[model samples]
Target: IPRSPVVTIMGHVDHGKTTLLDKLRKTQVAAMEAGGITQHIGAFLVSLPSGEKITFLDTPGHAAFSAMRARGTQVTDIVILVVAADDGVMKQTVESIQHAKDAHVPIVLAINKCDKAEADPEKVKKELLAYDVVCEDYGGDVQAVHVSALTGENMMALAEATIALAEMLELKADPTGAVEGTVIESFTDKGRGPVTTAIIQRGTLRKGSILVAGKSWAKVRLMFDENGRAVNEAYPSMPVGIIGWRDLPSAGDEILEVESEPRAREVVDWRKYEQEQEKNKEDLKLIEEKRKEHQEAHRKDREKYGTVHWKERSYIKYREKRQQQPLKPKEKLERDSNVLPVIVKGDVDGSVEAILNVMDTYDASHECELDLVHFGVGDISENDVNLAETFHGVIYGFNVNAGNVIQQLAAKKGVKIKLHKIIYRLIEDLQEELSSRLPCIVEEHPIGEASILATFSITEGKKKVPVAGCRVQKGQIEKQKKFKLIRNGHVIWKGSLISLKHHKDDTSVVKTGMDCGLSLDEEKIEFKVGDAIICYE
Candidate 1:
């Protein structure tokens, strides 16, 4: 029986996704000139030795693609998850696995990078078992194939495994139905304007046929297959790019059929409205949830701590007052509006979310916001670069790198791309950068000082220290204030007072000339008979 199965390849960066595709399309002449081969359009077709043709849609390995997979609307027959044997199952591997699981798509494990010196296929298998992806070695039904795209090791086995899985799943496509596909990637080329590549899930696409994708539709002036060869027609399960779109379709858009131009226009209009309504609803829902959480946290705090006096209430009132005030003329134009407006592309969802959360915290006073224009867990590609260029946004990468094409495009477009393995450092840098753009505010406060009386060190391993302390000089000593022991105005050691005690009773605050015993949670400080402790709050 003639068969066409649509498959999606997803994995972490450097797991040989692009290399595998390049090997698959090695015979095609046009593949040589393709920049970053699999960057912009990720759909490709492979003809097996047995004459069986399979189409593969290479979805981004980034965490942001999880949102697309989460909707469960995209048509995909099987998922090929590439895991580096040397690196084991990484963050993006887990994310891709979860996304496939969420979409209820059957996954075939491609244990890539087997030619590497540190490649540990067994360890990777063990890790897969933990995620319930039990390999054949572990008595699981899932087929795990080891392959090295670099050295062409076991690549045939990997391809065969994919075909075998497709057969087992009985994947099928309805050629009689109206053409329907999903936008794998969409971007405006300098010369071509809007270009989109899609995997035809059902029916057939003929040249000159007007296709509608979300809010955009156009006559197919040109069609190219996985190998970049021109094709007059494309059938179900064929991944192809078409030029002549009236406007740029949104990435992840569902491409549907419309009999006439009016119908296409109506469908496009309805889809635009629906998308806008959905986005608004989601934003409102998120804000409501945040408000409820804040209220709950406030309630808990109030229960734990007693009510504050008027001075403390003043700060709360000031914040409330600021919230109620409308934006001024200049403020309206300059205000960040608390939206981050970032295009986050990373290797995993956990890291992406963690980075976003950290950036969110830095937006104090609700003046700056964290907005994600496009977020996916994977290597940055040309499509991402195009989006960043169009949106005039920066791309944040976490434990992920950009393809050479994307990097070059970014450089040519002068787009800023920030990458980081450490999430906090990235957030810190962004916070400093944003803060520098805003007005500066500086505040001054008085520092209190105290003197140490005597010091006793605990055991070597213990960090606690006991001190027979008495405030010898001016000011008061407060618990939690950092202090430095001074001998003749030279600092000996620095520590914080854990608790203040007077006559063996713990006190919240201590006054000057008070004989109080104190214990430090940190290391013991050396003090002379006349050594004084200077405490600052």
Candidate 2:
């Protein structure tokens, strides 16, 4: 039987991908399912007034989608390629096009942000031509819908276009077969234990279905639709939340029906074993490559120098050069330096993964060592607080909660816990905290340069201090700043200015083009005419 089109919206981050999905979802139903630790379901169904329904995958980006596709799970039937009419095609837009083309999926170009002042749909369409995405406006069969997600303009037309494409593709699934699906998101709920949001791609998944998702196996005890309403069964192309998992399954993992408990256990164990074997194989191959590389180096040395001692000498010289190399400006923190040890917790596996991914993009490793002690999906627990205390770092929670007892324990242990419902706010707080934890670097900054016009002796108590009558040729010279004496361009002495006087009256600073008498802290310093005195911090 025919099923609704499973669509994935992809484009640049600021191209209104989420806005379009939210508009579609909001237009369909005003009320979303609420109750029992409510969160984003990762996927939802959008029903149009024309009686056509479409499923949208609300992914972080095309990265997770591609990862699933790499594992041979092609969940998206059609990709809605959203492009900002005013922004034109970006690097990510090209990448999205390439991914859609590689997957051999039909692309429905939705030119968004048409309501803006600089909206140029024609320019966007022309740019798409370079990517081989010739729209129907340019004599191609691909439908290009111009819609504004912000104003809810022409959204229904976009929906009709998607349905028309789906109808042409003749998408269908047999709901009577063994259950098959893909894990969209999963997390450990404090009350419900392991909860997973998945889309049933084929067959029917019911409450009693014994299934193995990724490495975890479970007999579905409860099922709910995207609206959070309890549902007994989920048909093909339906995104549903299923509970009763033995263990948390990761996103992009496959969901398959098993015959019995023993069969599910056998499948999980076999998968684990295969993964271990593959890891071992990869390790051995890596070692072999290194071994061969070292052998080749030795062989080259033997053929070129014809003596082991020569190679040894050359190697020592190379090591010396490496040791003398100056560190780059963005140098990594030392091992003993203070690090921002963090423990990240999120509402779901996908959210955690997205959080980690965004955090990785910030190159703060050079400023402070970002030590991610632990990360997982769930509410903040006592164990997390303990880890934060041990590591001397803060705990970051995104769309997750912490119990009162755990919060009190964190306070008692002097561990800081920052919780934010919005991901950007969490990132902002993390960056601020990270910068605040680092020690600042203090360096000498030159303030002014003056030349000694004359040399004199200033008697202070019983000592004769050397006073250099100088003219400020550069910036203004401050009375409190330190000074450096240079005799013929060579630094002779470095000391603070003891006294500054202008025409026998005490002065705090000497501006450019003015003359002043400045004395060094040391009394025995010899001041010479035509010598340079530099003022610095």
- Compared with the true structure, all predictions reach lDDT values of 0.42, 0.46
Q: Estimate, for each residue in 44-150, the C-alpha lDDT of model 1 and write its tens digit.
A: 44432322222244543322123222112223334555666555665555655444433344455665554452343322332343233334321112356444444
In order of appearance, the predictions have TM-scores of 0.37, 0.38
Alpha-carbon deviation at 369 in model 1, angstroms: 18
Which portions of model 1 miss their true places by more than 4 Å? 1-5, 8-178, 183-188, 194-197, 203-449, 452-469, 472-537
Cα TM-score of candidate 1: 0.37
Residue 524 deviation, candidate 2, in Å? 14
Best by lDDT: 2
- Residue lDDT tens for model 2, 1-537: 223445555566657566655664564333223211112245444432232223355443432233222112234445555666556665444444434433344446655554452343322332342233334421112456444445444444545565554443322333342333444334333224344444443333333233343345554544333323223333433453332111112222233332111111111222232332122111000000000001112333224333378766765665565467623112233233233466767654334444455455555444453535566655788887887776566787876778998989888888867787554235565556455435332223455787777645744332235655678887755566677767767876777766763344456787686776666554425665557677776
